Amino acid sequence: SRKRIQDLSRPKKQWRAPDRKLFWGNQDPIRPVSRNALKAQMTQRLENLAQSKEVS
Amino acid sequence: MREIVHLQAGQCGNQIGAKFWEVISDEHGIDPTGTYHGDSDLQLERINVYYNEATGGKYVPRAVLVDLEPGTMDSVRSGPFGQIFRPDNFVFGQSGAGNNWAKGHYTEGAELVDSVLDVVRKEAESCDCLQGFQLTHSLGGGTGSGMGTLLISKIREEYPDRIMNTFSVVPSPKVSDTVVEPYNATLSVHQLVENTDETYCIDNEALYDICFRTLKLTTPTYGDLNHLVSATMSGVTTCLRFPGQLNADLRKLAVNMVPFPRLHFFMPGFAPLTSRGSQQYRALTVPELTQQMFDAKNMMAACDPRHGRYLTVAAVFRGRMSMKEVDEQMLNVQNKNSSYFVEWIPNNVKTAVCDIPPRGLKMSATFIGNSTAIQELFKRISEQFTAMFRRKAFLHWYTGEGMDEMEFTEAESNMNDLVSEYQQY
Amino acid sequence: MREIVHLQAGQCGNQIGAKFWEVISDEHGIDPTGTYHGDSDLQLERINVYYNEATGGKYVPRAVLVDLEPGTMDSVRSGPFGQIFRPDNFVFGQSGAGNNWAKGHYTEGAELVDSVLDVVRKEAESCDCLQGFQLTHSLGGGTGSGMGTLLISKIREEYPDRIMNTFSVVPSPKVSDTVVEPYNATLSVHQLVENTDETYCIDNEALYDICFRTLKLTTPTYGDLNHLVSATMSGVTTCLRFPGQLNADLRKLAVNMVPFPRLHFFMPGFAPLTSRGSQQYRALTVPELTQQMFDAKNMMAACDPRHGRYLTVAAVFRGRMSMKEVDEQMLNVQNKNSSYFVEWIPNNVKTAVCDIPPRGLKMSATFIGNSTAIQELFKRISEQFTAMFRRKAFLHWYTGEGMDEMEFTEAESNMNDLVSEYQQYQ
Amino acid sequence: VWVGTWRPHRPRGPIMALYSSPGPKYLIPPTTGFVKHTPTKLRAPAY
Amino acid sequence: MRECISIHVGQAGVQIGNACWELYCLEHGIQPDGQMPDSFNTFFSETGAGKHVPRAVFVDLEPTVVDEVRTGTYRQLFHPEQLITGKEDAANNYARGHYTIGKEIVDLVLDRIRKLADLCTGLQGFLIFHSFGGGTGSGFASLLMERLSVDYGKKSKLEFAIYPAPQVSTAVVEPYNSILTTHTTLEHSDCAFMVDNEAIYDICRRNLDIERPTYTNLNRLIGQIVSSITASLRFDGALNVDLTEFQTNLVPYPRIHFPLATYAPVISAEKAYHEQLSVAEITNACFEPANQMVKCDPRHGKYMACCMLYRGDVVPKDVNAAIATIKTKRTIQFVDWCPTGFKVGINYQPPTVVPGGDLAKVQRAVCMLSNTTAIAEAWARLDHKLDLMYAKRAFVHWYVGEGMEEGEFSEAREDLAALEKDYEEVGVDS
Amino acid sequence: MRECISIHVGQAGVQIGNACWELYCLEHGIQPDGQMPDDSFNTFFSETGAGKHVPRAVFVDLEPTVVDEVRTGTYRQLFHPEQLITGKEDAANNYARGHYTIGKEIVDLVLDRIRKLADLCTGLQGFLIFHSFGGGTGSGFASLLMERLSVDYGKKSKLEFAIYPAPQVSTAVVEPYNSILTTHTTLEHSDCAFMVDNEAIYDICRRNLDIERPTYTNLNRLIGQIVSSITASLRFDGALNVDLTEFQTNLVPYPRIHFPLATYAPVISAEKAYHEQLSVAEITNACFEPANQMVKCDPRHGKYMACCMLYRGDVVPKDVNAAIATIKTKRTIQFVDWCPTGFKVGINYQPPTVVPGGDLAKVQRAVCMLSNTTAIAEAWARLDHKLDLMYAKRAFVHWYVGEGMEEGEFSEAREDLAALEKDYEEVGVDSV
Numbered sequence A: 001s002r003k004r005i006q007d008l009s010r011p012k013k014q015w016r017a018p019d020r021k022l023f024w025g026n027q028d029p030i031r032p033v034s035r036n037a038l039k040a041q042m043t044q045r046l047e048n049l050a051q052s053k054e055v056s
Numbered sequence B: 001m002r003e004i005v006h007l008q009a010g011q012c013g014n015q016i017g018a019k020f021w022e023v024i025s026d027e028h029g030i031d032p033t034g035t036y037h038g039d040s041d042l043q044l045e046r047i048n049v050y051y052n053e054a055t056g057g058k059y060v061p062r063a064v065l066v067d068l069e070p071g072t073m074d075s076v077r078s079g080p081f082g083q084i085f086r087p088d089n090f091v092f093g094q095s096g097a098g099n100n101w102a103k104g105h106y107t108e109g110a111e112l113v114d115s116v117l118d119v120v121r122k123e124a125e126s127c128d129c130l131q132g133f134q135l136t137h138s139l140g141g142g143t144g145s146g147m148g149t150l151l152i153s154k155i156r157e158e159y160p161d162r163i164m165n166t167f168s169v170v171p172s173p174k175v176s177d178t179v180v181e182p183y184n185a186t187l188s189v190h191q192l193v194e195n196t197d198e199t200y201c202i203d204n205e206a207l208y209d210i211c212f213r214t215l216k217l218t219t220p221t222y223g224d225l226n227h228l229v230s231a232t233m234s235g236v237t238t239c240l241r242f243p244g245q246l247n248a249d250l251r252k253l254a255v256n257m258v259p260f261p262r263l264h265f266f267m268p269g270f271a272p273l274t275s276r277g278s279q280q281y282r283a284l285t286v287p288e289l290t291q292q293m294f295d296a297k298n299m300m301a302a303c304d305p306r307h308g309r310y311l312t313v314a315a316v317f318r319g320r321m322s323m324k325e326v327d328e329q330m331l332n333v334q335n336k337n338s339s340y341f342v343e344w345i346p347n348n349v350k351t352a353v354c355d356i357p358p359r360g361l362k363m364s365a366t367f368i369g370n371s372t373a374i375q376e377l378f379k380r381i382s383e384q385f386t387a388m389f390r391r392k393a394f395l396h397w398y399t400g401e402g403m404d405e406m407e408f409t410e411a412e413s414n415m416n417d418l419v420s421e422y423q424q425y
Numbered sequence C: 001m002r003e004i005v006h007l008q009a010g011q012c013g014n015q016i017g018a019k020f021w022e023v024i025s026d027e028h029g030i031d032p033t034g035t036y037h038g039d040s041d042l043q044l045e046r047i048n049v050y051y052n053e054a055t056g057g058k059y060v061p062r063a064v065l066v067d068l069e070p071g072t073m074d075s076v077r078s079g080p081f082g083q084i085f086r087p088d089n090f091v092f093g094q095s096g097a098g099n100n101w102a103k104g105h106y107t108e109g110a111e112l113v114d115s116v117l118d119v120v121r122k123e124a125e126s127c128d129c130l131q132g133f134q135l136t137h138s139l140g141g142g143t144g145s146g147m148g149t150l151l152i153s154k155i156r157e158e159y160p161d162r163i164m165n166t167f168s169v170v171p172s173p174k175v176s177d178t179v180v181e182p183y184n185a186t187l188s189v190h191q192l193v194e195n196t197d198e199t200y201c202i203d204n205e206a207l208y209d210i211c212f213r214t215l216k217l218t219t220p221t222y223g224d225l226n227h228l229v230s231a232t233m234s235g236v237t238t239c240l241r242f243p244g245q246l247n248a249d250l251r252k253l254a255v256n257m258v259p260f261p262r263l264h265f266f267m268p269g270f271a272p273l274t275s276r277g278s279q280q281y282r283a284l285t286v287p288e289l290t291q292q293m294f295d296a297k298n299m300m301a302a303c304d305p306r307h308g309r310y311l312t313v314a315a316v317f318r319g320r321m322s323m324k325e326v327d328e329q330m331l332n333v334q335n336k337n338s339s340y341f342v343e344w345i346p347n348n349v350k351t352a353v354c355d356i357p358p359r360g361l362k363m364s365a366t367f368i369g370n371s372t373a374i375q376e377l378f379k380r381i382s383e384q385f386t387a388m389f390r391r392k393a394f395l396h397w398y399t400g401e402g403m404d405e406m407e408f409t410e411a412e413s414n415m416n417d418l419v420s421e422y423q424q425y426q
Numbered sequence D: 001v002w003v004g005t006w007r008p009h010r011p012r013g014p015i016m017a018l019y020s021s022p023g024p025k026y027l028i029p030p031t032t033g034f035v036k037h038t039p040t041k042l043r044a045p046a047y
Numbered sequence E: 001m002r003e004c005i006s007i008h009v010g011q012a013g014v015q016i017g018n019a020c021w022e023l024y025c026l027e028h029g030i031q032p033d034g035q036m037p038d039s040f041n042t043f044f045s046e047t048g049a050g051k052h053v054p055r056a057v058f059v060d061l062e063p064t065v066v067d068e069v070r071t072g073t074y075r076q077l078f079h080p081e082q083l084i085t086g087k088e089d090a091a092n093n094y095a096r097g098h099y100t101i102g103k104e105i106v107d108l109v110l111d112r113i114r115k116l117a118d119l120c121t122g123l124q125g126f127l128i129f130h131s132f133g134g135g136t137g138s139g140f141a142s143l144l145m146e147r148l149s150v151d152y153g154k155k156s157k158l159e160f161a162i163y164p165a166p167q168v169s170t171a172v173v174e175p176y177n178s179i180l181t182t183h184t185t186l187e188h189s190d191c192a193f194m195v196d197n198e199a200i201y202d203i204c205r206r207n208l209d210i211e212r213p214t215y216t217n218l219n220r221l222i223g224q225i226v227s228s229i230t231a232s233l234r235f236d237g238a239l240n241v242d243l244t245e246f247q248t249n250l251v252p253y254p255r256i257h258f259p260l261a262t263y264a265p266v267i268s269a270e271k272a273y274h275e276q277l278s279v280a281e282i283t284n285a286c287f288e289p290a291n292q293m294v295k296c297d298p299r300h301g302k303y304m305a306c307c308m309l310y311r312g313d314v315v316p317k318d319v320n321a322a323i324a325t326i327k328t329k330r331t332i333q334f335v336d337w338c339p340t341g342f343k344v345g346i347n348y349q350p351p352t353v354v355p356g357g358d359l360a361k362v363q364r365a366v367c368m369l370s371n372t373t374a375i376a377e378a379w380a381r382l383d384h385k386l387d388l389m390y391a392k393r394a395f396v397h398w399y400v401g402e403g404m405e406e407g408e409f410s411e412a413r414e415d416l417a418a419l420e421k422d423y424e425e426v427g428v429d430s
Numbered sequence F: 001m002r003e004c005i006s007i008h009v010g011q012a013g014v015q016i017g018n019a020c021w022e023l024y025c026l027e028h029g030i031q032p033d034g035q036m037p038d039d040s041f042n043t044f045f046s047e048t049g050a051g052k053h054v055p056r057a058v059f060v061d062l063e064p065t066v067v068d069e070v071r072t073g074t075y076r077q078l079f080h081p082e083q084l085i086t087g088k089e090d091a092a093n094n095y096a097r098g099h100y101t102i103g104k105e106i107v108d109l110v111l112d113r114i115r116k117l118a119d120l121c122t123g124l125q126g127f128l129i130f131h132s133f134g135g136g137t138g139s140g141f142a143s144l145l146m147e148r149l150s151v152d153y154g155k156k157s158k159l160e161f162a163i164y165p166a167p168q169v170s171t172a173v174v175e176p177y178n179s180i181l182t183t184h185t186t187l188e189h190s191d192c193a194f195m196v197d198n199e200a201i202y203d204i205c206r207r208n209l210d211i212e213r214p215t216y217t218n219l220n221r222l223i224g225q226i227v228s229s230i231t232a233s234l235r236f237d238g239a240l241n242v243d244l245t246e247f248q249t250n251l252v253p254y255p256r257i258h259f260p261l262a263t264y265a266p267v268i269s270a271e272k273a274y275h276e277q278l279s280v281a282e283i284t285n286a287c288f289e290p291a292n293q294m295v296k297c298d299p300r301h302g303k304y305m306a307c308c309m310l311y312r313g314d315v316v317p318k319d320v321n322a323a324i325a326t327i328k329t330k331r332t333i334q335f336v337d338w339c340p341t342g343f344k345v346g347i348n349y350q351p352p353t354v355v356p357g358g359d360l361a362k363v364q365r366a367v368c369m370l371s372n373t374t375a376i377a378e379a380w381a382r383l384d385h386k387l388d389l390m391y392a393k394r395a396f397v398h399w400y401v402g403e404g405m406e407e408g409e410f411s412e413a414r415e416d417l418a419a420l421e422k423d424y425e426e427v428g429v430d431s432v
């Protein structure tokens, strides 16, 4: 019967992931940069997104 | 006889300088009409530093009002203390730069510079001796961060030896106010390091935290926020205007504070900050002032003292006290938490004591600090810049008005070198 | 110039220590506003043992008011002496305490401890010379029992030589107002045994019996309970404030009191208690205090002192008495009850004679006793703990919030060790 | 943060004030047509 | 800073909330219009002109009850968005309650719950009003609180639900669907009080002199206990207890979380001008077998954890003697693994009376909360009554025709047998 | 200094202008008949020496049936008689006719009126094009006028407030023809395009507002109200002023990606906000609802890249960033990795006005949220699906080529819109 006591003693199951604990007065951002857009991303070939001049 | 000329560009610099010219007109007793209405002598024998004379006893301030958007001109002109400024320094553009550095520096911001250099030169040629250049602006705006840097480049290329002072606000780490904040922030102050020698980084979330959890104000507005900066602004240059027992000018706030020409970034402060609900429950003494000077709750920057290590510290005291308890308290500061001070400099503090405290209070202090934790701010700015740069995220508004791809890389390289040299020491 | 820092954690602790400032501010003649309006001049000389200063002559005590719920600061600020504290000295929380260990020690309390050491270092560094720390809490809840016990650990390592004056309200054998009291008692006095230097164990049941039987109240309110505790509270530190023929400070009441570092749990008391209608009937003399001092029915702890021996006995006499009497009766009670005093300690009693008694009495006394009979209390707390541990009654509520199984086992083991040392030297 | 001998104490569990209300996340059914209508409008007749 | 959110699902909850949101208006000072002629913050927010906002949501799939509420004298008090109607009834079906019609309206009621929780700073729990019998209060509240758990997490949920009375009922499928109701309770609920209808009838027949009782008297007698739960939350007292420890000091094991409710001094106004009650007998007035709000005999199980919230002019000296003389007798029996037993709560506010009402103006008033092993029989009879219907597969075709399956029923019977085994195991001594 | 020119054309544009100049006259002291019973009226009104104020806009249409009521009704006293340009024959749901045969001819007066309106204003700021995407005069004539203005005035800013075809509600059948064929012309010669549709405004007027059976006046007054705060900072002093030319360097990361959304949060009835406190933290939090948008898109499947908040009236500058920070903490609003900053704030010192007797409620707060997302890419997928199903058998091509030009421009739609569809996918791909 002791295994049943161990079965009720198992507390619970959680559903909401706890929210992020934030600290103020520091130079850290709220949403962290993923470190793969830091120095691991590379540009694409059709990235011709430049400034559109006046007419000619 | 020993003058300082004030400059401001942009909405941020203009609305900070407005509160500045209110508070320093109040310390010297000048009404918004322009006459003298103080009731002493010590505020009248050194008034020419910030003001000029005129016929009939009119005291005209020495300031330069520039902005490419003329919207803030009508706001500061029709404000409380807006009728003292002379109507010839009001130079303005018609097309606003609008948070673009290229419009503020190269193609439109440079076209109004020939008009502002004339007024700056005319102001600087009517003084007996020049000591400072006071600039207030925003570090990631368009006109404040665009033409203020151009102005100080022109001044430093024409006046080589005069000390210059920026009182500028920096982008906050928690909330963002513009999407092009990293671009302007990185690319404008990589001409701050090689030009300037005494700069003051101010945040806006730390000022809000000061107004909420220390001053305890329920509705802290911008008019009540720029007064907080203007207090430190007026408190830095106190020994120039009033006598004292250990008098330090701005030049002696440079040798004792700047050991290397790159490392010159300072975080300001102001000690006697408390709510009116506990003003009577404290006693205004030197120990609580020097305790709250070195607290994170009385600084204008979001850099904690923990993150780095203090190099130099300045602390200007005002009022009637004695100096040995001041020096003893500085010694206990150096000796108690010695893990936050550099070992290879024996004394890390500079003290100056004035004689005239501000109105209302009986004593006041002004905290200026140098530490190797300001590099944490530039690490975040370089992080954001490199994240926004390689996708060419907002380079469309730059490369079409006289930019280059490699110029951004040079700015990021300078920032990485600055952070590396801060870490090295 | 010899300073003591006051802390209060939990609403029970805040209630028992909030009235404590009433018997001190009136002893020093201080208005509830804070100004001085007394008649004498001796009570103003040593006022920097509990208070601070302000311009214009207002006096503000040092206190770190700490709680987890903002439902106390609308009450203790609105009480009789709410205006005397300092608004920046208030520390609060948002979420509830829940009367559990995890929300005082690990999850909620561990967030708040960085911001209570800020005000502890605010006050403890503006003093001249520090003696120690004064803390009011309970042993059957979650805030005072758990978070204050965290706070003594977060203070003790910073100040390794100062003294920790804690004040414990112990769960009673017959009355309990909480269902998880044995857990919060064992988890507290597992770690309370090795940081603080003197604990004053107080039972609500014995103190209620004192209120019903000795001074004859029919309807005892909580304020009249806290007043009776506060008399002893201010009776210990009366040598720091007023002159005396035989002075004995807080450190002298620490060396002479423990023979071993872990047997430091004390039974407090207060001698001159009388009914309402029998105050002016006669003058109080010194042979009629020791009979009120050395009886089981004056003791604030439910453990009957006659179920053991006494190791170290204190008597903080307050008033203008002779010294031959206050030693001759101690010799007489030592010879009268030989079996209630140990054999290997020759003198079992310390006397300390002050001068100033409290207002309303021309004479007073204070009793602090360290007796072996308090091992009965730990035994019943351990048995009530193991009653809920042979079947894991409420371990569901702890183990889901960072708790783990076997530290309860080692805390019960720690209680067994404390019981065996307390019995072994008897 | 630990850039010396001092460090901040770390709570072992989540704070109950963190468990707050999620913001805009639910799609509430449209009020035009017949394919998906709220039971709060008197619906228009199809034919 | 001590907020509570109230949800009223089905008719059996909205009809109680009707009495509750006039009792709370009388307890403070807000005319039903909503305006005023500072502790009301735990049920009301503010406007610029000065109206007060009830923090409650009124939802049902039948527009009748909310429609007659809107036409009454509460139109100005409420906002037209907490009064959420529906088109077509849940039709007495646990399947229909949350699968076809009740599946969609969740996205509107939850959006309004989210707008209610953002205006408060100290939100603690949920006050859901439903019933175990029908389909709106049993199916919609099921899935609603089910995804409330994934919407908020550790924030507690307090249902005030009624039970199938052991020898009277209205619906036939009440035991067929009440078992399926509890398949969401023991993992998304922490304390749901059980107050059926027959025992309130017996209470108002014996303790009261009233004849032909209506639903209004039962709703008021339930709302008195509901208001007494949040007494220390709104007002000051000697022993302040809130919802967060109410979760802990009452519930030993996560499955064993269904306690009882009892309001002791329900004495008629006609017999109120002569006698004045006292603490030493009002404590015994909670533990009588004929004074409780569920028709189960307490001798049938040992007590586990008791919680009494004394309200009014109560001094803590004699509640000690009350519990001490409670411990001495033999009919009131606790478990061996709980030496401490009880939980004491004292406030400073006597209960409010309602004009044209039934209760009297008493001085002291104790609300008793307790869980006992006796409720295992109250589940055992509902189990057996479902087993008799299921042996011929009676009403299965009215449930599998909407979206449920027999394979769901095959995972549905055995958990309540496991719960009976849990109660039997936790009842024994060591 | 701070003047702007707005062009109204078509029927949707002219009715929006009819509703909008009501609000423009109501904000200032200008009567509906021109006079008054101060330098904040120079952005929208000129001054004549007799006290008459003349508006800075144009009303151009190829039909007279909708300009006649302006020329005869309440506002014939206000607008310039030669700015009230009327046509002869309708474009009649045809891009080709109103772009090449009848719309080519009348612009010699439209551009002349624009020139004479531009010779009064000194510091011109930009252009506000008011038309619809699914007509002939709205989608063809305004397109050609936008070509001519781009090739004449150079780098002046161009803004579009246009009516987009809803996925279900649509009154015409040639909508995907002359709607997609406008997009060859828009994105090359434009800086922003604030699209709205008609189904989402119906939902807003029905659920947030409580008006039943809404005519076009309600939708057009909502449009006038949301464009009333887009030029709020150009004329009213404020703490954090955001002028017109800094909209584009905040909203536009790439010149192709300049198709943002629009949202006006405090839209509510008189007897609904009376039971409400309308704090800042619960107004900007309502700008991010899917049910508050003026275009039917799902931002849950979209990825925000830029934002702007333009507050009005009594707004404390402290609760704004406190409301942004809690948004940053919530996970329901996800940004892209290459925008770590996100937001832009503007605070003004003027409460929003309300029309007297109108459906809106008086307040002293107003929030306009402008943002571009990747969820707009689904609003082009449905029109591409429509054109692929309709052009597959050459449904209505004879009405288009009958004006004299080939069907090659229809074949130019698929590669251009395919590029606009796949680069939107490319700019939202994560870091991998």
Ligand SMILES: Nc1nc2c(ncn2[C@@H]2O[C@H](COP(=O)(O)OP(=O)(O)OP(=O)(O)O)[C@@H](O)[C@H]2O)c(=O)[nH]1
Pocket: E009, E010, E011, E012, E013, E015, E016, E089, E090, E091, E092, E093, E131, E132, E133, E134, E135, E136, E137, E138, E162, E169, E170, E171, E197, E215, E218, E219
């Ligand atoms: N106390 C009280 N009980 C009620 C009231 N109305 C109904 N009941 C009880 O509720 C039971 C009926 O089941 P409910 O859950 O209320 O049914 P419902 O809420 O209308 O849900 P649906 O039948 O699906 O519409 C009956 O046995 C009644 O005892 C009421 O107004 N007050």
Ligand SMILES: Nc1nc2c(ncn2[C@@H]2O[C@H](COP(=O)(O)OP(=O)(O)OP(=O)(O)O)[C@@H](O)[C@H]2O)c(=O)[nH]1
Pocket: F010, F011, F012, F013, F015, F016, F090, F091, F092, F093, F094, F098, F131, F132, F133, F134, F135, F136, F137, F138, F139, F163, F170, F171, F172, F197, F198, F216, F219, F220
């Ligand atoms: N919201 C709103 N939409 C309008 C209004 N007036 C017209 N529309 C829209 O305009 C669309 C018709 O396109 P238009 O550009 O007006 O057509 P046109 O201007 O008459 O030009 P032709 O079609 O060639 O005759 C309809 O689908 C409507 O959705 C209005 O007042 N309010």
Ligand SMILES: Nc1nc2c(ncn2[C@@H]2O[C@H](COP(=O)(O)OP(=O)(O)O)[C@@H](O)[C@H]2O)c(=O)[nH]1
Pocket: B009, B010, B011, B012, B013, B015, B016, B067, B097, B098, B099, B104, B138, B140, B141, B142, B143, B144, B145, B146, B169, B177, B178, B203, B204, B222, B225, B226
């Ligand atoms: N903290 C603070 N920041 C301000 C204040 N006024 C303006 N700013 C900042 O200034 C920046 C705008 O700079 P701006 O003057 O528009 O640059 P410009 O366009 O080149 O003139 C914003 O990012 C604000 O954060 C103020 O009173 N306090």
Ligand SMILES: Nc1nc2c(ncn2[C@@H]2O[C@H](COP(=O)(O)OP(=O)(O)O)[C@@H](O)[C@H]2O)c(=O)[nH]1
Pocket: C009, C010, C011, C012, C013, C015, C016, C097, C099, C138, C140, C141, C142, C143, C144, C145, C169, C176, C177, C178, C203, C204, C207, C222, C223, C225, C226
């Ligand atoms: N003797 C006495 N006991 C008290 C008083 N106030 C509270 N208590 C006791 O405190 C116990 C509850 O502790 P509690 O305050 O809930 O613990 P906490 O919430 O974690 O601080 C009860 O058993 C009461 O008997 C008091 O004024 N005097």
Ligand SMILES: [Mg+2]
Pocket: E010, E011, E062, E090, E134, E136
């Ligand atoms: Mg129903």
Ligand SMILES: [Mg+2]
Pocket: F010, F011, F063, F090, F091, F092, F093, F135, F136, F137, F138
């Ligand atoms: Mg047309």
